[PDB]
Amino acid sequence: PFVPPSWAPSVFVPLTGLVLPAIAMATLFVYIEKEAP
Amino acid sequence: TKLFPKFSQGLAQDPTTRRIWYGLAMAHDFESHDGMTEENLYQKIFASHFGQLSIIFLWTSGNLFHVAWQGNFEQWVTDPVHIRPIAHAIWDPHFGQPAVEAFTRGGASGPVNISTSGVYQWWYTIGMRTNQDLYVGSVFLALVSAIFLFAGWLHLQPNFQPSLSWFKDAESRLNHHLSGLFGVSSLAWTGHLVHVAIPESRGQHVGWDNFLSVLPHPQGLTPFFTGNWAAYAQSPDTASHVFGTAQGSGQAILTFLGGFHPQTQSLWLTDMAHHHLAIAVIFIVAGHMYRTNFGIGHRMQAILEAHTPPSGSLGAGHKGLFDTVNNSLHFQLGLALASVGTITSLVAQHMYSLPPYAFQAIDFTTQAALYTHHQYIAGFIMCGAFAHGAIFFIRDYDPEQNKGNVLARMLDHKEALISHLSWVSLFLGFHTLGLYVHNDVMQAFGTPEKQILIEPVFAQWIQAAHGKALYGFDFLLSSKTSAAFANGQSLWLPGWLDAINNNQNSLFLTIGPGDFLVHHAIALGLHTTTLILVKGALDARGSKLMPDKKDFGYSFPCDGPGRGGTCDISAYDAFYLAVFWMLNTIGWVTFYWHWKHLTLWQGNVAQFDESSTYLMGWLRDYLWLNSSQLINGYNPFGMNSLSVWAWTFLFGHLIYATGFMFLISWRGYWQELIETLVWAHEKTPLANLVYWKDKPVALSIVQARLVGLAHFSVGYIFTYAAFLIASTSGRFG
Amino acid sequence: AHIVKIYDTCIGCTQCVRACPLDVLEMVPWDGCKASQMASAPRTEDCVGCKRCETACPTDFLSVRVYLGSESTRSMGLSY
Amino acid sequence: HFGQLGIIFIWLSGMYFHGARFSNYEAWLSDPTHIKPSAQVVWPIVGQEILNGDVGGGFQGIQITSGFFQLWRAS
Amino acid sequence: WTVPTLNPDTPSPIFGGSTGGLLRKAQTEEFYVITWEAKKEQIFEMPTGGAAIMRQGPNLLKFGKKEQCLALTTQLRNKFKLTPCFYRVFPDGKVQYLHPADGVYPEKVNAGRVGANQNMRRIGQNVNPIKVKFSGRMMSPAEI
Amino acid sequence: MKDFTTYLSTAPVIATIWFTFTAGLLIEINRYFPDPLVFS
Amino acid sequence: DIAGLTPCSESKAYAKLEKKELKTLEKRLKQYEADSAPAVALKATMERTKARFANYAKAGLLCGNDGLPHLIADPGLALKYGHAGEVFIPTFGFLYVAGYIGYVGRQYLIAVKGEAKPTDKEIIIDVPLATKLAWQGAGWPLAAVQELQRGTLLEKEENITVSPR
Amino acid sequence: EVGPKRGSLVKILRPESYWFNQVGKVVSVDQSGVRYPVVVRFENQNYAGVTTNNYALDEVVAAK
Ligand code: CLA
Ligand code: CLA
Ligand code: CLA
Ligand code: CLA
Ligand code: CLA
Ligand SMILES: CC1=C(/C=C/C(C)=C/C=C/C(C)=C/C=C/C=C(C)/C=C/C=C(C)/C=C/C2=C(C)CCCC2(C)C)C(C)(C)CCC1
Ligand code: SF4
Ligand code: SF4
């Protein structure tokens, strides 16, 4: 029941190494630059 | 103005890039935030601790999950001697085919990393036998991580926020943590060993499905309630027992054999069961010492107030210290890091010489990594212990409320303390370096018999007191007629003496002149590092060169070029300089541990005995000799499984060298260089259409010291980690 | 903006005012010293934190003190 | 500048003198390809005489890399 | 003495120009103008680099930050014995005058000035940092 | 001559003579008593 | 013997070490003439090597498994078994010289503090005074102790500057 | 008539002074009621190179 599929690394490695960092950097860059009301 | 950081208006109004760097670096200094109150300070810290706890249990869950999913635990348990554990799988699209083949090993489906953390031996010892055992543990700890995270949220809510006085109830917290956190946890761990771990070591499966119908001992609790507690120590595992099987096994659940299991070369499980039962009773008892709502016990303030020597030798004594400790978090954190930092060293010292996990000794790479791992962490924690002691003096120390007590009197004779630490450091350095250089000159001129080799008689005399008969002192446990030898001759000496006199294990290794010199170098490291840290704390509040240093804080750049120059004058800078000496000290310790063990593991201890008395031997026979396989991980002909450590080895040298740039060249040079870059961008067509929102500036004076120290430390760690693992694993693994 | 404070040990030598490269300090009448004048810091918003004033003060310990504080375009000495 | 020139002459004089009195130059001229140039000799104290290596020509001394033997031959 | 009014049409020294001059800051935040009278044409050193010739009579220069204006003022006073004065000019057109704030250079004591940031105590009589803790912001004992 | 002897009394000149003497004594002792390791 | 060590005179490894060093010297010898300058120097070295190994054995040192002398530092073990000359006796030899140097320097420093310009007496040494103090330092342990008992060795706590605390 | 005599030696008691617990020579004592009338000179300079400083009446005591 626990064993993940044999293709899990193919999806999660690019996802956590290329995709989430891109969204995280965009989120952080916008946040720090945001001006107070 | 900018939103980030929300906790400091001074930073948010800064138009330069310093706002970004400083916002990150002051996030967790809650005392410096805008609008902070004492009560809000404690509630934030309480919430932060729940977050740390959740990360720890999630990190542990990830290790359990990946070993079960991608490791070879079930195969390793069958033949732990001749199988390398697997940490996790590799999916790197940058790999070439030779790399994919090189890292395929251990019968795995594809490329994998070999584990060095020893979790296999630990988990196997405590009763884990199958991948499903690890899967259930992983889900359980992921759930525990979630619960702590929820509790962190819960106790921030309006009706669940503890008051300020709740965090300052010292007597009640000590009673619970000693009896419940320590005592009951150790009692519960005894339950696991008696019910699960020990039976699994004797070939009997015990799980949640059948543990209520399995008797840990043939006589169930009759000896316990009748006082005949000796019945639990009868028929222990014999010397022929094969771990994990019922052949040669016994029945006892509590013993004091005192030695090593002959097959696994690790501590007996029945001794570790009786160990944890013993301290649990002591800790539960010790947790009934302090006052609470029931009218009995001590109040810690009364104890401190009493202990004033009648002769006035310690002045006011310990009067006023309860408020000094109970009101300052930096004082409490300094005591916590100092205590935990020392215990981390103790863990490293005792785990390599009294290996508690089955088949841990034969895994040389694991033993090397575990000792180095915890000694470097202990070193960092000790530096932090003194840093927060220095922060206490600046921020929390109140001279009026500590008038004449022990703490105040430490500042009275701080010059005497620092002067004597200075003398000891100079004495050890002069004579330790001098003897090494003398021995080097003798070796260079071809007269090895002219060198100064001092026998460690004092340390060899201690080993005699413990039963090591090699030196012929015939002292205490080394003499068969002493009362000490006789009394323990029926409980643990037969096992202890057998192990200490076995020269193939690391229990009280034989020492000689080579160990004399290295130990005195270690003392130099401890004393000098203490000197730097102690000066940084005692001089934190002021000095002749800066009488009012307290008014500037713990960390400031300098007081300018006046009065001769004041670079690195803050207490923050004393810690910064002390980190270098800490790395140097722990480096000497870990080189000494590693080289003395490599020669033992190869059987040629004579190399260390002969080559360790001069510094060319270390450079030649340890660093240069053992780098041969590391730097051949990849070469113009191909690569092998060590190419990752070869790559990481150079990776460390690069980060280390990059740190020199931030430490040698200082800000003024770089700020003027950045000003031409600002000019160039504005005048460049097609690029001045784009523009920045934060004005570029050079790193600050203080920032570059931290950034330089971070690169220095990281390169330090990664270089030796790659060499330590590669030299040990390739040689034997 | 940095913080600059003048303490009552000032002897009115005027050296701090001459040293300052941003005209942050000035001398004002006083009755607490022989010179009958004291240093003043009316324009600290222009202070950059060089501490040339502290280098120039003869009194021991200093009578003028600079505490580096919040940064800005003026205090960071930027021309861009 | 005269002081700097005077110092160089002492230094140059020492190099020529040590070639005359503490060198194997004459032996080197006969067998240049097998004899190692040497123009410094150490005293036998505290066991430092091991630095007087076997350089050829029945001579013991420190091998020099300053190229003075080649310069002298050319002149 | 009355506050001088800046004359934007004042002639400027004979200077070829350099790359060390004003940047985009002058167009968005502020810049500084220094003016003085010259007895005779003479060569002086620009704080931005290079040499310029001052015309006889009024002269005017524009600089990127205050320290540059007061650096030129020191040169003109010490060597050429002149009496320059400079302003702060904002992009909206407002002009702020300073140095000399009251017409007399700050080194010379003048009646009418009000002491600022003066503590009637010594450095050694400040309170301990613990007594100014949790005051809403990082505060030194000297501030209170 | 008074000034010249004053020059010889300067710190660098004294140290050179003193250490030249001190070194010479140690060198000469080891020339006549080579390889001392134990008082004996 | 002590700590498992054995006398170097009875040590097999110690004897073998001497042969190795002499063999190395002999190998270089046979490439020279009988009485040439290099040969004489090599023979002199061999004589010192033989003398050195005889002296250390005659001194009754202890050799380890490495076959190299080891020194005994505990005063009780040294005096018990006649190893006082390794560390114990040289300990009091050094302290006498170290105290001599330090005491002489302290006497000179006190002497010039009374002069009008002490600083000029430190860069420019008063050689006549220094030689006078150099000879009187031979009795420093006696003079040092008497100062301690009379209470003039240490300054008063009230006459020493210290930082704020 | 106020303060120690000119040329006499006094011991400094200002903890923040470079010459705390040290002896200096009194140069002059102001009689105008200023905050720090006593002027003291020292034979050893402080970190800034100064050898003179002003002290209040209660910050200086006679040698011993
Ligand atoms: C975990 C992080 C990570 C991952 C998963 C990758 C993955 C990859 N890198 Mg690496 N790389 C990384 C980090 C990473 N890199 C970092 C940190 C650096 C800097 C040190 C580099 C520097 C680097 C270089 C310099 C190069 C690579 C290249 C590659 C490729 C090698 C395999 C190949 O033959 O691709 C072949 C690739 C393809 C057949 C195409 C794959 C898909 C493309 C790239 C994107 C498609 C997008 C799609 C059409 C639209 C958007 C979809 C999206 C919204 C879901 C592969 C795509 C090589 C390459 O080919 O890059 C292009 C290459 O030259 N990387
Ligand atoms: C029985 C009741 C009880 C219990 C179980 C706890 C438990 C805890 N409290 Mg405490 N607490 C209590 C009552 C209790 N408290 C009461 C009554 C009060 C009010 C007065 C408080 C007030 C309080 C505060 C204010 C805080 C805590 C915190 C904590 C946590 C400390 C961190 C931790 O996990 O250390 C675990 C420590 C150990 C298991 C022992 C460590 C020392 C041993 C000797 C190390 C070596 C052991 C062994 C060899 C290691 C094996 C390792 C393995 C890999 C093989 C912990 C969960 C802190 C926290 O984190 O809160 C979230 C915190 O901030 N408590
Ligand atoms: C449990 C222990 C503990 C706790 C609760 C704290 C808490 C605190 N410490 Mg203390 N400290 C500790 C341990 C602890 N410390 C230790 C072990 C040390 C010794 C190393 C120190 C040394 C220390 C100093 C010197 C200072 C503090 C300060 C602080 C305060 C601010 C922290 C901050 O803003 O960080 C912000 C965090 C950062 C800027 C980044 C931290 C990470 C560093 C730079 C290393 C990063 C390495 C990186 C991950 C490697 C990447 C590798 C690559 C290959 C990928 C805060 C109250 C500061 C303070 O204000 O005190 C009053 C302060 O001056 N601490
Ligand atoms: C190999 C590098 C090295 C060395 C040898 C030293 C040596 C020393 N450091 Mg330093 N240090 C280093 C690196 C080093 N440090 C680094 C990288 C840092 C980080 C910035 C520091 C930061 C630091 C601090 C913060 C402190 C020290 C201190 C010390 C002293 C410790 C006590 C001691 O050993 O006394 C014995 C002395 C020595 C071993 C020094 C070398 C002596 C030589 C061999 C004498 C040769 C004389 C001979 C006649 C030849 C002269 C020739 C010449 C005339 C041409 C000592 C002077 C502490 C100190 O000063 O304590 C009093 C101290 O507080 N160090
Ligand atoms: C630096 C500390 C130190 C240490 C760890 C030792 C260690 C040792 N000494 Mg040594 N000793 C030292 C300093 C030290 N000594 C000093 C400074 C002196 C005075 C100069 C002596 C004088 C001395 C004598 C006279 C004797 C020893 C002996 C011993 C051994 C056993 C007794 C002992 O001292 O127990 C541990 C040490 C201490 C607690 C420190 C104080 C030790 C005192 C001074 C001597 C105790 C002697 C003891 C009563 C002898 C009883 C008979 C014995 C066979 C059991 C042991 C190897 C004995 C020996 O040779 O045994 C084989 C012996 O007879 N020592
Ligand atoms: C500066 C400061 C600080 C800090 C501090 C520190 C950081 C410290 C540390 C410290 C340390 C880190 C210490 C340690 C110690 C230890 C000890 C003291 C030990 C002991 C031991 C013993 C006593 C033992 C004994 C024995 C033996 C040897 C054998 C057998 C068994 C027995 C047990 C008998 C604080 C926070 C307070 C605050 C204020 C300031
Ligand atoms: S602060 Fe110092 S330099 Fe300025 S007037 Fe006062 S005494 Fe003179
Ligand atoms: S720190 Fe610099 S700018 Fe500020 S008052 Fe002092 S001299 Fe003037």
Which residue in the block uniquely carries the two structure tokens 């539960």? B284
Q: Residue B550 has what DSSP assignment?
A: G
- Report the distance separating Cα B625 and Cα B260, nearest Å: 33
**Partner residue opposite G28 with nearest CB, options D54, D58, D59:** D54
Query: What is the architecture of the domain spanning G1-164?
Result: Orthogonal Bundle (1.10)
Name the residue among B275, B280, B272 with its Cα closest to residue B237.
B272
- SS3 at position B299: coil
Q: Whose CA is nearest to atom 9 of ligand 6?
A: B338
Q: Whose CA is nearest to atom 7 of ligand 7?
A: C10
Strand order from edge to edge, sheet including H38-41: H52-55, H38-41, H23-29, H9-12, H60-62
Length of chain E: 144
Q: Whose CA is nearest to atom 11 of ligand 3?
A: B384
Q: Count how many Cα atoms sit within 13 Å of the Cα of residue G151 in the half-sphere of its side chain.
A: 2
Radius of gyration of chain C (CA): 13
Residue ranges per structural domain of chain B: 2-732
Chain centroid to Cα E37, Å, comes to 17
> Which residues have CB under 8 Å from B682's CB, separation 6+?
B688, C80, E23, E24
Which residue in the block uniquely carries the two structure tokens 């950045």? B674
β-pair partners for E37: E58
Q: Is the dihedral of CA B637, B642, B643, B647 positive or negative?
A: negative
Technique used by the depositors: cryo-EM
For the CA of B93, the nearest atom of ligand 1:
32
| Test the C interface: residue of B22, B544, B555, B559 with most C CBs within 10 Å | B559
Pocket test residue of B388, B394, B656 for ligand 3, highest count of atoms within 8 A of CB: B388
β-pair partners for E52: E44
Chain centroid to Cα E122, Å, comes to 30
- SS3 at position B455: coil
Q: Do C67 and B552 touch (CB under 8 A)?
A: yes
- Pocket of ligand 5 contains residue B285 by CB under 6 Å: no
Q: Whose CA is nearest to atom 61 of ligand 2?
A: B49
H/E run at residue E42: strand E42-45
Distance (Å) from CA A18 to ligand 1 centroid: 8
Is the separation of the CB atoms in B292 and B179 below 8 Å?
no
Other CB atoms within 10 A of residue B604 CB = 11
> Which residues have CB under 8 Å from B548's CB, separation 6+?
B542, C61, C65, E123, E124, E126, G164, H16
Burial of C1 from C-beta contacts in 10 A (0-12 / 13-18 / 19+): middle
Is the separation of the CB atoms in C36 and C12 below 8 Å?
yes
CA dihedral B725, B726, B730, B732 (to 10 degrees): -20
Return the CATH number of C1-80, one of 3.30.70.20, 3.20.20.70, 3.40.50.2300, 3.90.70.10: 3.30.70.20
Three-state SS string across E68-116, please?
HHHHHHHHHHHCCCCCCEEEEECCCCCEEEECCCCCCCCCCCCCCCCCC
Length of chain A: 37
Annotated binding-site residue? C10: yes
- Report the distance separating Cα B475 and Cα B317, nearest Å: 41
Residues in chain C with CB shorter than 8 Å from the CB of B562 are 51, 54-55
- Report the distance separating Cα B314 and Cα B319, nearest Å: 11
Q: Count how many Cα atoms sit within 13 Å of the Cα of residue G48 in the half-sphere of its side chain.
A: 22
Q: Count how many Cα atoms sit within 13 Å of the Cα of residue E111 in the half-sphere of its side chain.
A: 0
Residue of G nearest to D47 (CA): G45
Q: Do H21 and G164 touch (CB under 8 A)?
A: no
> Which residues have CB under 8 Å from B504's CB, separation 6+?
B600
β-pair partners for C3: C67
C-alpha triplet B601, B604, B606: angle, nearest 5°: 130
Is the separation of the CB atoms in H60 and H19 below 8 Å?
no
Distance (Å) from CA B382 to ligand 6 centroid: 12
The fourth-level CATH superfamily of domain B2-732 is Photosystem I PsaA/PsaB (1.20.1130.10)
- SS3 at position B249: coil
Strand order from edge to edge, sheet including D53-54: D38-40, D60-63, D53-54
Q: Which residues of B354-363 are buried (b: 16+ CB within 10 A; e: fewer)?
A: ebbbbbbbbb
Q: Residue H57 has what DSSP assignment?
A: G
Distance (Å) from CA B180 to ligand 2 centroid: 9
Residues in chain C with CB shorter than 8 Å from the CB of B548 are 61, 65
Radius of gyration of chain H (CA): 11
- Report the distance separating Cα B626 and Cα B602, nearest Å: 13
Is the separation of the CB atoms in G35 and G86 below 8 Å?
no
Full set of structural domains in chain E with CATH: 1-143 (3.30.1470.10)
Burial of D39 from C-beta contacts in 10 A (0-12 / 13-18 / 19+): buried
Burial of B21 from C-beta contacts in 10 A (0-12 / 13-18 / 19+): middle
- Pocket of ligand 2 contains residue B185 by CB under 6 Å: yes
Is the separation of the CB atoms in B534 and B386 below 8 Å?
yes
Residues in chain C with CB shorter than 8 Å from the CB of H16 are 61
Is the separation of the CB atoms in C44 and C66 below 8 Å?
no
**C3-7 vs E118-119, strand pairing mode:** parallel
> Which residues have CB under 8 Å from B414's CB, separation 6+?
B538, B539, G165
Name the residue among B32, B34, B701 with its Cα closest to residue B395.
B32
- Backbone φ and ψ for G143, nearest 5 degrees, come out as -65, -40
Name the residue among B621, B598, B641, B612 with its Cα closest to residue B367.
B598
Which residue in the block uniquely carries the two structure tokens 């934060």? B694
Distance (Å) from CA B339 to ligand 6 centroid: 8
Residue ranges per structural domain of chain H: 3-63
- Report the distance separating Cα C7 and Cα C59, nearest Å: 10
- Backbone φ and ψ for G6, nearest 5 degrees, come out as -135, 150
- Report the distance separating Cα C5 and Cα C39, nearest Å: 9
Q: Count how many Cα atoms sit within 13 Å of the Cα of residue B254 in the half-sphere of its side chain.
A: 16
Side chain identity, residue B302 = A
Tokens of B100: 């994919």
Is the separation of the CB atoms in B193 and B269 below 8 Å?
yes
- Report the distance separating Cα B669 and Cα B657, nearest Å: 19
H/E run at residue B682: helix B667-683
- Report the distance separating Cα B273 and Cα B192, nearest Å: 9
CA distance B9 to chain E (A): 9
> Which residues have CB under 8 Å from B172's CB, separation 6+?
B290, B292
β-pair partners for G6: G63
Q: Does H14 touch chain E (CB under 8 A)?
A: yes
- Report the distance separating Cα A6 and Cα A4, nearest Å: 7
Distances (CA, A) of B446 to B232, D46, E21: 63, 12, 70
Name the residue among H2, H46, H57 with its Cα closest to residue H20.
H46
First to last CA, chain A: 51
- Pocket of ligand 7 contains residue C11 by CB under 6 Å: yes
Length of chain B: 733
Tokens of B184: 């009951």
CA distance E32 to chain B (A): 19
**Partner residue opposite H17 with nearest CB, options C32, C58, C61:** C61
Q: Count how many Cα atoms sit within 13 Å of the Cα of residue B617 in the half-sphere of its side chain.
A: 23
Pocket test residue of C20, C65, C71, C76 for ligand 8, highest count of atoms within 8 A of CB: C20
β-pair partners for B2: A35
- Pocket of ligand 4 contains residue B584 by CB under 6 Å: no
Side chain identity, residue B7 = F
Touching D: F residues 15-34, CB under 8 Å: 27, 30-31, 34
Is the separation of the CB atoms in E119 and E142 below 8 Å?
yes
Q: Does B307 touch chain H (CB under 8 A)?
A: no
Chain centroid to Cα D19, Å, comes to 5
Q: Whose CA is nearest to atom 50 of ligand 2?
A: B347
Helix pair angle (G88-113, G140-150), 10° resolution: 60
CA dihedral B68, B70, B72, B77 (to 10 degrees): -10
Residues in chain B with CB shorter than 8 Å from the CB of D50 are 445-446
Tokens of C15: 């050296």
- Say if C and B touch: at least 3 Cβ pairs within 8 Å: yes
List for chain D the helix, strand, coil content (%; round to 5).
50, 10, 40
Is the separation of the CB atoms in A31 and B3 below 8 Å?
yes
CA distance B35 to chain C (A): 17
Residue ranges per structural domain of chain G: 1-164
Q: Does B567 touch chain H (CB under 8 A)?
A: no
Alpha helices in G59-157 (DSSP H): 75-80, 88-113, 120-123, 127-136, 140-150
Is the separation of the CB atoms in B26 and B32 below 8 Å?
yes
CA dihedral B191, B192, B195, B201 (to 10 degrees): -140
Is the separation of the CB atoms in E69 and E48 below 8 Å?
no
Annotated binding-site residue? B383: no
Q: Do B448 and G77 touch (CB under 8 A)?
A: no
> Which residues have CB under 8 Å from B161's CB, separation 6+?
B43, B155
Distances (CA, A) of B450 to B440, B443, G3, G67, G71: 11, 9, 21, 12, 12
Pocket test residue of G1, G2, G74 for ligand 5, highest count of atoms within 8 A of CB: G74
Strand order from edge to edge, sheet including G6-7: G6-7, G62-63, G69-70
Tokens of B44: 């934030």
Chain G residue set in contact with H, beta carbons under 8 Å:
158-164
Other CB atoms within 10 A of residue B539 CB = 24
Tokens of B515: 């160990």
For the CA of B338, the nearest atom of ligand 6:
7
Distances (CA, A) of F12 to B645, F8, F22: 53, 9, 15
**Partner residue opposite C78 with nearest CB, options B559, B682, B695:** B695
